[PDB]
Short mmCIF file of C-alpha atoms and ligand atoms in Angstrom, two decimals:
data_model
loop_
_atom_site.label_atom_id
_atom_site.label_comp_id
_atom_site.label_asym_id
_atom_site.label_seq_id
_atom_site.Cartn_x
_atom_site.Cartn_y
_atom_site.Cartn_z
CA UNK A 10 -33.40 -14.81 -29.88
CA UNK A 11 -32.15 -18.38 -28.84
CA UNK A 12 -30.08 -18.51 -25.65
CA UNK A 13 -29.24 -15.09 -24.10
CA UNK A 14 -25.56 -14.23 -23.01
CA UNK A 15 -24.68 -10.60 -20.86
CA UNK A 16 -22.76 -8.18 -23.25
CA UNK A 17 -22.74 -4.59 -23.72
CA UNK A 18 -25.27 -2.47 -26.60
CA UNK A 19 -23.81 -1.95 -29.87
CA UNK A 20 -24.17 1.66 -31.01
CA UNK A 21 -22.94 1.58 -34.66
CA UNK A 22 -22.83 4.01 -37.25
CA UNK A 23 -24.84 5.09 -40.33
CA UNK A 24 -24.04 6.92 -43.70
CA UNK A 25 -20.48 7.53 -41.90
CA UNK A 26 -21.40 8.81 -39.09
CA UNK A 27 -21.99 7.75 -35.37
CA UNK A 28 -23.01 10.54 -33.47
CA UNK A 29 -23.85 9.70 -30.05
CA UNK A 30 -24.62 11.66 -26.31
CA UNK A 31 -23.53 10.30 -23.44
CA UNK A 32 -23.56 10.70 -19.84
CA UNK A 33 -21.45 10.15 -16.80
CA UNK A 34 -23.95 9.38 -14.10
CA UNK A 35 -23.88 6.93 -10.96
CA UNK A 36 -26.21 4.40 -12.11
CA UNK A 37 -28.20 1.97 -9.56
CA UNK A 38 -27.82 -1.09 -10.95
CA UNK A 39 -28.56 -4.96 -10.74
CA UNK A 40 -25.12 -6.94 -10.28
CA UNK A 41 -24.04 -10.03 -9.21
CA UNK A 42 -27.24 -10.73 -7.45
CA UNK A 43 -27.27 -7.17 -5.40
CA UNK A 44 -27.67 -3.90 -6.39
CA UNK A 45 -24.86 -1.04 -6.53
CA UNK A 46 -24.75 2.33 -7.90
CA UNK A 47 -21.97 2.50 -10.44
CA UNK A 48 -20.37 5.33 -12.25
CA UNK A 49 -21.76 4.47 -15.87
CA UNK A 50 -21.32 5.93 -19.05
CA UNK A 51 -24.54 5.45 -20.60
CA UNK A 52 -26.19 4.06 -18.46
CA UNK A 53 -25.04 0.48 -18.05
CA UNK A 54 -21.89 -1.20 -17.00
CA UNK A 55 -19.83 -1.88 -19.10
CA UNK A 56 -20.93 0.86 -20.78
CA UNK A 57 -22.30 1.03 -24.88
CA UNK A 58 -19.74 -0.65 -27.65
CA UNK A 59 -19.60 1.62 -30.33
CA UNK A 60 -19.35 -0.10 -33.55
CA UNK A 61 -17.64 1.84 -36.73
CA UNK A 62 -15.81 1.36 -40.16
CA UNK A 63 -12.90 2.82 -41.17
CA UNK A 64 -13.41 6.79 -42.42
CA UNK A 65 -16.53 7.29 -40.13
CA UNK A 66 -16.72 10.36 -38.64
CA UNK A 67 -16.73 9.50 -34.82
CA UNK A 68 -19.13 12.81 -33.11
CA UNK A 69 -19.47 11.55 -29.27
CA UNK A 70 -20.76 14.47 -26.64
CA UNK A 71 -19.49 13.22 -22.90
CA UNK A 72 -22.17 14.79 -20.72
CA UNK A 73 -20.58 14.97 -17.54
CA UNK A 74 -23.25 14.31 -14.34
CA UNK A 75 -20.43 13.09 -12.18
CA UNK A 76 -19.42 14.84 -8.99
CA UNK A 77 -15.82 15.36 -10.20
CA UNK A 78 -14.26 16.47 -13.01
CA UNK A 79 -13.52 13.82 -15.70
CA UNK A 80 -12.59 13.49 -19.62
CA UNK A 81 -11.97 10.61 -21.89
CA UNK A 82 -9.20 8.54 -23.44
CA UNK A 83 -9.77 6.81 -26.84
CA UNK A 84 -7.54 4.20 -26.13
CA UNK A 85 -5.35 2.98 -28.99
CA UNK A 86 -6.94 5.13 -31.42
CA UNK A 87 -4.59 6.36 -33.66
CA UNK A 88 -6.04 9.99 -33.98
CA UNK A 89 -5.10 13.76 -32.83
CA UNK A 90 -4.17 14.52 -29.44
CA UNK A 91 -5.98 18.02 -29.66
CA UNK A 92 -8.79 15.23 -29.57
CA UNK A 93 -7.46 12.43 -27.77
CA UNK A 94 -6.49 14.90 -25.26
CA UNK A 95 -5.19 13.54 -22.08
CA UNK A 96 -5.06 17.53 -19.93
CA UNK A 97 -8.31 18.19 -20.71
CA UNK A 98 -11.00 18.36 -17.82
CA UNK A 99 -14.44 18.46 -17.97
CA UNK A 100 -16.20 20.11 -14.93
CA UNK A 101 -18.94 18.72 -13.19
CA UNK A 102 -22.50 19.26 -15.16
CA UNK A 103 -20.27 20.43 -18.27
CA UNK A 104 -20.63 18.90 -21.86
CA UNK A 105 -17.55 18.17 -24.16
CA UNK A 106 -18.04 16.49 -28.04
CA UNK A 107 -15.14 14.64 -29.33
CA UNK A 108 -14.95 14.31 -33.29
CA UNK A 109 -12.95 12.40 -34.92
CA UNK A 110 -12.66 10.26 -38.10
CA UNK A 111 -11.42 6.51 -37.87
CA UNK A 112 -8.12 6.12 -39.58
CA UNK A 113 -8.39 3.70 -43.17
CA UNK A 114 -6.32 0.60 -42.08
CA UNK A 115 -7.46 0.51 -38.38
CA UNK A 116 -9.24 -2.84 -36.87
CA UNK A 117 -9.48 -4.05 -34.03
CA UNK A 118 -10.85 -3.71 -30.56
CA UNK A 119 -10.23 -0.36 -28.60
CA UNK A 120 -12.10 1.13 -25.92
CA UNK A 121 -12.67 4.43 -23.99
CA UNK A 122 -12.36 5.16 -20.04
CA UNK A 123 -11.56 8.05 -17.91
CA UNK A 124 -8.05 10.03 -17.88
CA UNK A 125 -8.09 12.81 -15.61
CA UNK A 126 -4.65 12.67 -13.89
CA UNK A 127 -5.02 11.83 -10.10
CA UNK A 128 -8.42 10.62 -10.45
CA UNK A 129 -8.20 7.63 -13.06
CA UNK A 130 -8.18 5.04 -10.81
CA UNK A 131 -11.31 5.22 -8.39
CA UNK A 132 -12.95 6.74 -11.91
CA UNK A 133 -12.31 3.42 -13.80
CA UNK A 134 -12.59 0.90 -11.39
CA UNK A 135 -16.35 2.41 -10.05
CA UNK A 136 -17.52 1.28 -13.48
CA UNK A 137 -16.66 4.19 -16.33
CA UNK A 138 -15.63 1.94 -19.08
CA UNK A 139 -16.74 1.02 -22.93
CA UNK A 140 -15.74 -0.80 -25.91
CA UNK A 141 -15.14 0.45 -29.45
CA UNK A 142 -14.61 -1.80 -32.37
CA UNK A 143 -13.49 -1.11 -35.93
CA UNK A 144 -14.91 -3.64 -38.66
CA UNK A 145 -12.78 -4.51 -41.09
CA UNK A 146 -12.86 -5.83 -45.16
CA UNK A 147 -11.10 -8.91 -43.63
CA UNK A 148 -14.40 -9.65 -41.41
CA UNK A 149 -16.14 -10.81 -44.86
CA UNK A 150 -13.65 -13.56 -45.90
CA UNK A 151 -15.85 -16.95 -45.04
CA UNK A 152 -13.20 -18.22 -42.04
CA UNK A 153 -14.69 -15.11 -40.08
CA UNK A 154 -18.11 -14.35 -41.74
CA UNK A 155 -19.22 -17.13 -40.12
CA UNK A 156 -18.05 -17.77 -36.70
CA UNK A 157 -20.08 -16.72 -33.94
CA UNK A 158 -18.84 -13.32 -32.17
CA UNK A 159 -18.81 -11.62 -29.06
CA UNK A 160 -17.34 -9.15 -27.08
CA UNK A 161 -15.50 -10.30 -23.66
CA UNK A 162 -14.79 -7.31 -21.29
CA UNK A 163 -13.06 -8.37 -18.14
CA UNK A 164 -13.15 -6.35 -15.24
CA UNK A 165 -12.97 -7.15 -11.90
CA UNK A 166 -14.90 -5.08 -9.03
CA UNK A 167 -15.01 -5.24 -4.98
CA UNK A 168 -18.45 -3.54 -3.48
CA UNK A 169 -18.88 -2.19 0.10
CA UNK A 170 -22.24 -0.47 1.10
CA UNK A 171 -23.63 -0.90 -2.55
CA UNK A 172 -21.10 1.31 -4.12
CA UNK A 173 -17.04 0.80 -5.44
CA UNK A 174 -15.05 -0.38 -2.59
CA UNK A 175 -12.61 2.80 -1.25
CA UNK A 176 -9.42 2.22 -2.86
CA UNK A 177 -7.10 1.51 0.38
CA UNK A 178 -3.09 2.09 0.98
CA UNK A 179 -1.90 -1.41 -0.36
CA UNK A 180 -4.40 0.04 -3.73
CA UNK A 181 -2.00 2.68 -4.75
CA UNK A 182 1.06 0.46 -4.35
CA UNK A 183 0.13 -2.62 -5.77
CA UNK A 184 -3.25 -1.45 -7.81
CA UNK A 185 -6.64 -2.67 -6.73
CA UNK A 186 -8.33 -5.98 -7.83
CA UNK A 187 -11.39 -6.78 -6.43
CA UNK A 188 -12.86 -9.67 -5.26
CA UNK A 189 -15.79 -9.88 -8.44
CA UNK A 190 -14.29 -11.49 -11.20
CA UNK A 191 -16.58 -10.24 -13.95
CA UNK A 192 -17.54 -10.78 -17.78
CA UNK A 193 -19.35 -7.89 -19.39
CA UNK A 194 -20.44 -6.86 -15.73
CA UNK A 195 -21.76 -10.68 -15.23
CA UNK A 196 -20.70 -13.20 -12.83
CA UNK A 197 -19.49 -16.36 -14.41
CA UNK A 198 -21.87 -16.30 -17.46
CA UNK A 199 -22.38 -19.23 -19.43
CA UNK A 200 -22.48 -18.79 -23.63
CA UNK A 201 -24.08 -21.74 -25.55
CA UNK A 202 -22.36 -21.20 -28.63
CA UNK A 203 -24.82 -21.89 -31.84
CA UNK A 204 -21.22 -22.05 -34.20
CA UNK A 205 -18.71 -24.32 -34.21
CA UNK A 206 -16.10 -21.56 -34.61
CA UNK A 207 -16.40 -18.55 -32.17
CA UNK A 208 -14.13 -15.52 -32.53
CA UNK A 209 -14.02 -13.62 -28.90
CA UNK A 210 -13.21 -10.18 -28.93
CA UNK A 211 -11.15 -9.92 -25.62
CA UNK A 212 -10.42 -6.22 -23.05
CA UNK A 213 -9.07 -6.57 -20.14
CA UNK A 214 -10.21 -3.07 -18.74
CA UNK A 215 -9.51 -3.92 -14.78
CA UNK A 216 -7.63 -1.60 -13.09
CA UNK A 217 -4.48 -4.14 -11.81
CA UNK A 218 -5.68 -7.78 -12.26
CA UNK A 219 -4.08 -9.92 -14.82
CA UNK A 220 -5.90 -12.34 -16.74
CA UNK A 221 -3.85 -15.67 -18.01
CA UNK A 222 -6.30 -17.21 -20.37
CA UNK A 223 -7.19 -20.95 -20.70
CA UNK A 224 -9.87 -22.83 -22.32
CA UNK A 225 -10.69 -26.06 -20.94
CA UNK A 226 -9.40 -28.73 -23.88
CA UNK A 227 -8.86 -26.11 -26.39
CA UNK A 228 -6.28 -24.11 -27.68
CA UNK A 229 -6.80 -20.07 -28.60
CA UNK A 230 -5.92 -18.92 -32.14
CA UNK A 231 -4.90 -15.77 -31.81
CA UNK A 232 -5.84 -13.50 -35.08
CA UNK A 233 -5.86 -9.75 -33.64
CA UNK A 234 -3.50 -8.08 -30.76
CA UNK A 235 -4.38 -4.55 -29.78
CA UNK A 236 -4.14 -2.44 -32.39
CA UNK A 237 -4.43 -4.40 -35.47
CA UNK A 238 -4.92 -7.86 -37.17
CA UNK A 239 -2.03 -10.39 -37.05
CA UNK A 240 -0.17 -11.90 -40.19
CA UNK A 241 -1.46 -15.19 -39.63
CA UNK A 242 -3.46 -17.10 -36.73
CA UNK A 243 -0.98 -18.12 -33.58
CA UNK A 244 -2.19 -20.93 -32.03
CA UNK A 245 -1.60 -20.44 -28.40
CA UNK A 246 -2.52 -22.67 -25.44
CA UNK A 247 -3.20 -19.88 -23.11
CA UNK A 248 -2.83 -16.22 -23.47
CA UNK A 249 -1.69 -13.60 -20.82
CA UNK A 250 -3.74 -10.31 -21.31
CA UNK A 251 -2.60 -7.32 -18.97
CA UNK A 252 -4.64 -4.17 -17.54
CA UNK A 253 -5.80 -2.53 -20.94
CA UNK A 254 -4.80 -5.11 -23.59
CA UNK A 255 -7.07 -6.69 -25.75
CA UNK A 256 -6.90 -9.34 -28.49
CA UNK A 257 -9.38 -11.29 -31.01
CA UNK A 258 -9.30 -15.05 -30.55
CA UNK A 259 -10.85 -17.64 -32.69
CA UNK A 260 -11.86 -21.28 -30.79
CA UNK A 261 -12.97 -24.24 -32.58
CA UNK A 262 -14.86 -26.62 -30.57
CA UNK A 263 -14.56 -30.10 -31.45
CA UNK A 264 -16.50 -31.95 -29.52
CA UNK A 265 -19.80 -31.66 -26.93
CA UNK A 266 -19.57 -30.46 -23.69
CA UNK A 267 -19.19 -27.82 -20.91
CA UNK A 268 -15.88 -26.00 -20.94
CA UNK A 269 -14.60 -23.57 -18.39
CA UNK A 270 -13.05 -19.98 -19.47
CA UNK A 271 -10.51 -20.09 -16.53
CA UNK A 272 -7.44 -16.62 -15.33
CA UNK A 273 -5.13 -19.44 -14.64
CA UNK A 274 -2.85 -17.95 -11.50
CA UNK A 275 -0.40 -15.72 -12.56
CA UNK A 276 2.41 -13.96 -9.90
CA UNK A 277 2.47 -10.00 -11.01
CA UNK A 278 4.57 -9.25 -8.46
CA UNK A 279 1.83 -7.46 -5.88
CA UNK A 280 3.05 -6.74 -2.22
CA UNK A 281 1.70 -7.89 0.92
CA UNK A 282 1.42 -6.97 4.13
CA UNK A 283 3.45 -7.77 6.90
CA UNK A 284 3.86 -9.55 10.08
CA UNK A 285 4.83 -12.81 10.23
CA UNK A 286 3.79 -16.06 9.08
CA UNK A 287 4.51 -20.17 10.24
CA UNK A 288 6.45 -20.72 6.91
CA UNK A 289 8.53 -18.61 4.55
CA UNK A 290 6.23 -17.15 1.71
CA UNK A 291 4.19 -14.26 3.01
CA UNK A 292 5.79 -10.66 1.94
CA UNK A 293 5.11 -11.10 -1.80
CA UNK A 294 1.38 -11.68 -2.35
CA UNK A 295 2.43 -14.52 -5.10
CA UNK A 296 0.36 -15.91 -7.62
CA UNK A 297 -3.45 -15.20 -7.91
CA UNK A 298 -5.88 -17.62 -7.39
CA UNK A 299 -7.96 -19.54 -10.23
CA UNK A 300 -11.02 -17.84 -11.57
CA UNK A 301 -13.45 -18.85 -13.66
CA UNK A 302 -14.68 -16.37 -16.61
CA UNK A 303 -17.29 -18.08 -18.03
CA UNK A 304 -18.96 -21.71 -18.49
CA UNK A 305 -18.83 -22.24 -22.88
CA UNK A 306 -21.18 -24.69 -24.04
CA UNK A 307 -20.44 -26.32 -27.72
CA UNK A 308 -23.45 -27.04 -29.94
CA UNK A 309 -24.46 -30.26 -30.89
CA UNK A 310 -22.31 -32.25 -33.33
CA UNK A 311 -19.55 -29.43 -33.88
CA UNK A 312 -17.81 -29.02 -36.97
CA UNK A 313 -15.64 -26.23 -36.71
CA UNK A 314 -14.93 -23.97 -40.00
CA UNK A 315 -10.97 -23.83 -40.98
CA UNK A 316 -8.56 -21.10 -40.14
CA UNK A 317 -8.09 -18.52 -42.67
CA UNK A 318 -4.46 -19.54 -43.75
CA UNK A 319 -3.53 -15.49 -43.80
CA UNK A 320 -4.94 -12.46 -42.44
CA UNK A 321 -3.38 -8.64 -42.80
CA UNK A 322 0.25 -7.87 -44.12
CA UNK A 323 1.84 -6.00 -41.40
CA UNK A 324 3.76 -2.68 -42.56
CA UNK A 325 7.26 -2.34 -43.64
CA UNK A 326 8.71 0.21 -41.02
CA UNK A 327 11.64 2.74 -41.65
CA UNK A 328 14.38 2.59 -40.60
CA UNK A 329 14.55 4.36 -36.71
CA UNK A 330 16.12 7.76 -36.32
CA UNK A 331 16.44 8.23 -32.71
CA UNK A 332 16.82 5.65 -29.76
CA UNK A 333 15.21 6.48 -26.59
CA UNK A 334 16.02 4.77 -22.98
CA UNK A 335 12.69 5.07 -20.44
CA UNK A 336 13.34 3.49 -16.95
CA UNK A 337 10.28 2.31 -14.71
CA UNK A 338 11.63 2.50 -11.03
CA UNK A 339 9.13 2.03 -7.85
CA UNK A 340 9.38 2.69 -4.42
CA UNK A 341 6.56 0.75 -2.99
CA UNK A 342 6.51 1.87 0.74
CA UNK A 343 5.97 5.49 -0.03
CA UNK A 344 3.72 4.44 -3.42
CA UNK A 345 5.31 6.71 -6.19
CA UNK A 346 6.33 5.27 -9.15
CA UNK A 347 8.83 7.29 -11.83
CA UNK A 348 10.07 7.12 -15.44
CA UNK A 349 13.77 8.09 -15.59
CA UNK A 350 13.43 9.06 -11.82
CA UNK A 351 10.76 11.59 -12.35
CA UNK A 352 7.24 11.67 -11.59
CA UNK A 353 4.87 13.23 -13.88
CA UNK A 354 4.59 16.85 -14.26
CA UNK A 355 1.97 18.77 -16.70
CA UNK A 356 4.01 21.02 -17.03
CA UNK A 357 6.87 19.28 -18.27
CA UNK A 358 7.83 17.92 -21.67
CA UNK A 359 9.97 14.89 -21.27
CA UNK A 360 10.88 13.93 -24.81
CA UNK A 361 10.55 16.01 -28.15
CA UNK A 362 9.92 13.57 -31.18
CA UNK A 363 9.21 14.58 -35.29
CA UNK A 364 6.02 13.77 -37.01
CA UNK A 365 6.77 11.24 -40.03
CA UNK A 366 9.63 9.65 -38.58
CA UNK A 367 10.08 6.16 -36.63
CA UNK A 368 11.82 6.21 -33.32
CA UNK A 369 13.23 2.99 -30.93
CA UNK A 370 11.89 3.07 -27.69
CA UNK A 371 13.82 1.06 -24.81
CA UNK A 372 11.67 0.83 -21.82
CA UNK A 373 13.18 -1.14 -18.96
CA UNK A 374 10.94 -2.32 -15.70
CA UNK A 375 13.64 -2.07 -13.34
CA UNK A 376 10.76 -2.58 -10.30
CA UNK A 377 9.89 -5.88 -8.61
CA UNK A 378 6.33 -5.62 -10.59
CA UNK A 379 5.16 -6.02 -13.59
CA UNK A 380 4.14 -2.87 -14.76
CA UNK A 381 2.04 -2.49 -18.77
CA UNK A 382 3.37 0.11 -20.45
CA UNK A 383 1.37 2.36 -22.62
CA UNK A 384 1.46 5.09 -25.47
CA UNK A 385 -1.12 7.45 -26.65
CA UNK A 386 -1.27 8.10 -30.03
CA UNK A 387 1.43 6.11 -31.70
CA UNK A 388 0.74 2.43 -32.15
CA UNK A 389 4.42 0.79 -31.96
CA UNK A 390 5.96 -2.80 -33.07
CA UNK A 391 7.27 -4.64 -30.26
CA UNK A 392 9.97 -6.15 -31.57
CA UNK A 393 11.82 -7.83 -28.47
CA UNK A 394 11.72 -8.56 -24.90
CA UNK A 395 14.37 -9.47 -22.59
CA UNK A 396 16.85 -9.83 -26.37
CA UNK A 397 14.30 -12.34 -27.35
CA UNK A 398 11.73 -11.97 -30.19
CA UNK A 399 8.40 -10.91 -30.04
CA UNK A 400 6.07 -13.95 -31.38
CA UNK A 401 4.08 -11.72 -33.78
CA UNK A 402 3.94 -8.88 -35.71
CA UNK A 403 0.79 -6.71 -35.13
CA UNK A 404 0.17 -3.10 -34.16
CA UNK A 405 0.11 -2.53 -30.05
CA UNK A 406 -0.86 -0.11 -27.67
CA UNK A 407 0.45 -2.22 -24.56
CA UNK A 408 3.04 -4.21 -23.78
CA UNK A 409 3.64 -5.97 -20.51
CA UNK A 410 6.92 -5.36 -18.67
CA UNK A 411 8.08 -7.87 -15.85
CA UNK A 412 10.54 -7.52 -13.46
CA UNK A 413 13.81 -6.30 -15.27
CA UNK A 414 12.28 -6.85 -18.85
CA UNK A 415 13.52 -4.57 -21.68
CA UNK A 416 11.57 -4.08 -24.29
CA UNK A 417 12.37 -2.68 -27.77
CA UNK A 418 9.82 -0.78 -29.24
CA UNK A 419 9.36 0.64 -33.20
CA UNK A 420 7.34 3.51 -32.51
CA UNK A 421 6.26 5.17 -35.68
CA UNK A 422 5.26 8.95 -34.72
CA UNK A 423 2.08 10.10 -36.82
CA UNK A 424 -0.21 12.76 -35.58
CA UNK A 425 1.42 16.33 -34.07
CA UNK A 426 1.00 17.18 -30.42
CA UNK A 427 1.59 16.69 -26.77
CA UNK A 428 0.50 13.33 -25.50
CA UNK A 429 1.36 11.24 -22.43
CA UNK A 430 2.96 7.65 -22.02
CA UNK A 431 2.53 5.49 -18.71
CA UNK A 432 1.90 2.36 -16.55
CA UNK A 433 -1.60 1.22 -17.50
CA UNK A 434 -2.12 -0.67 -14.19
CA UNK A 435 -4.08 2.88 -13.25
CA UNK A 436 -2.55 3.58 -9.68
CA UNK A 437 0.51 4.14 -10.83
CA UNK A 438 -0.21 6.28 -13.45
CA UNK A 439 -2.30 8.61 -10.05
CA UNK A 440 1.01 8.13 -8.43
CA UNK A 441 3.73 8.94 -10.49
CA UNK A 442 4.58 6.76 -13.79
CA UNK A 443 3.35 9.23 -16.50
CA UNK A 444 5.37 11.20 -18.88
CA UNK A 445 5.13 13.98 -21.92
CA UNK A 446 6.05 12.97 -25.21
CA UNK A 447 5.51 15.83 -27.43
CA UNK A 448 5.64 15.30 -31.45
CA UNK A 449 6.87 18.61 -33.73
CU1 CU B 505 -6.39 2.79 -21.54
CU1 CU B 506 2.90 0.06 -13.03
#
């Protein structure tokens, strides 16, 4: 009822338990005015938000009707890689249930996509994407009981002959963005709030395209980063959110009026093509171009709640036991990307960890892109980047590298098993920057 805004179903659980079948199907569907046949889960693009409390059991059956093989990761989901299991493959026509139970401090916004080596890339960007959020005790304090919520998934898309534009040779080298700049699979939707205080849910789950948030005459307050709540709201003016980051915003709108969502233009560092132009800028692609989100409409009169003045204690860690050095090197002609000079091999383990104990990672983009680095499994602290301190202290899953960045990373190392790290702009990870962490 009241005004209607695009965003995904909620499937949430019940007595404990959300048990759930799902398929993998190309899906004709209705989208930005045409129609194109997706890869769905589900049904619908994005697909279903699944919607849990901490200690549900989790009991999802993928249903694969794709033409290819395909499996899932639970991205930033602190559980088992015998579940979160990134060598898996699920054949064509082939059924798979993943069961798991959600950990008792986890909150936040996660999601689930596609992470068959080699194929990730055309997988995710034809549409094979979801949301998963876990409610937390905090969510009852008055400051956030009663602002107005929604999920935001970005995702960009490019269409030719009704279906996901082939990726092309300049995709795997620079990842692909495509030319529909989309919110919850909606062009430029517009969301009359009915509350004064919102609190947005934000995924970035585009293959390659960066998203520098801005509000029109308002700053963000940022209260959750991937993996966890912060200590305290940040106030931000604008807020950078790379290929498979999210975070949970509150806005409080002052006054009346029509205010654009804008992805300010931000330079990740993408190659173009060559021959030659009149003036001097033309091999880098430099900075993207505005885009508008979404069109946010305040209510009438607004009186915005206040900010909760705290939010979750983050974690005393241990002290570290082992430093570890990974390099990110490109070479952009040829498209292969490496960590420590290697490409990623199945077969090979490329570090040996110990459950229970807290390791510093040092990963170090020395490419002319930014590349997003990513862990399975382990949520880490980022403490600094580039010898400067990180602004908050939450739990991540993600954390954006440019061009000669270090960053030092406490990564605690929970659950046993063989799990993968790698660039989470997705064509790299198809073409090389993927490695085996396995934890003893
Ligand atoms: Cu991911
Ligand atoms: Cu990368």
């Amino acid at each position: 009822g009241g005004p209607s805004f695009p965003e995904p179903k909620v499937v949430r659980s019940q007595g404990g338990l959300l048990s759930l079948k799902l398929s993998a199907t190309p899906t004709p569907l209705a989208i930005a005015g045409q129609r194109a046949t997706l890869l769905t889960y589900g049904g619908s693009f994005p697909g279903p938000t699944l919607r849990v409390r901490p200690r549900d059991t989790v009991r999802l059956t993928l249903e694969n009707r794709l033409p290819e093989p395909t499996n899932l990761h639970w991205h930033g989901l602190p559980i088992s890689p015998k579940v979160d299991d990134p060598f898996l493959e699920i054949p064509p026509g082939e059924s798979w249930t993943y069961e798991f139970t959600v950990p008792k401090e986890l909150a936040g916004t996660f999601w689930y996509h596609p992470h068959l080596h080699g194929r990730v890339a055309p997988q995710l960007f034809a549409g094979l994407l979801g949301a998963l959020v876990v409610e937390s005790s905090l969510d009852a304090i008055p400051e956030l009981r009663e602002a107005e919520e929604h999920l935001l998934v970005l995702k960009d898309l490019a269409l030719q002959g009704g279906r996901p534009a082939p990726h092309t040779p300049m995709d795997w080298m620079n990842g692909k963005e495509g030319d529909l700049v989309l919110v919850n699979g909606a062009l430029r939707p517009t969301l009359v709030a009915q509350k004064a205080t919102l609190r947005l849910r934000l995924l970035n789950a585009s293959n390659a395209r960066y998203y520098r948030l801005a509000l029109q005459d308002h700053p963000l307050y940022l209260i959750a980063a991937d993996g966890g709540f912060l200590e305290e709201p940040l106030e931000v003016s604008e807020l950078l959110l790379a290929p498979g980051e999210r975070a949970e915003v509150l806005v409080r709108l002052r006054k009346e009026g029509r205010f654009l969502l804008q992805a300010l233009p931000y330079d990740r560092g993408a190659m173009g093509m060559m021959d030659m132009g009149g003036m001097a800028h033309a091999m880098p692609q430099g900075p993207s171009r505005p885009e508008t989100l979404l069109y946010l409409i305040a209510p009438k009169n607004p009186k915005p709640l206040p900010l909760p003045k705290a939010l979750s204690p983050f974690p005393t860690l241990p002290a570290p036991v082992v430093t570890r050095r990974l390099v990110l090197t490109e070479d952009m002609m040829a498209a292969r990307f490496f960590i420590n000079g290697q490409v990623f091999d199945h077969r090979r383990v490329d570090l040996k960890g110990q459950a229970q104990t807290v390791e510093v990672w040092e990963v170090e983009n020395q490419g002319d892109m930014d590349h997003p680095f990513h862990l399975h499994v382990h949520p880490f602290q980022v403490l600094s980047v580039g010898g400067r301190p990180f602004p908050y202290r939450a739990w991540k899953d993600v954390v954006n590298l440019k061009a000669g960045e270090v960053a030092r990373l406490l990564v605690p190392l929970r659950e046993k098993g063989r799990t993968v790290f790698h660039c989470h702009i997705v064509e790299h990870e198809d073409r090389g920057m993927m490695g085996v962490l396995e934890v003893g």
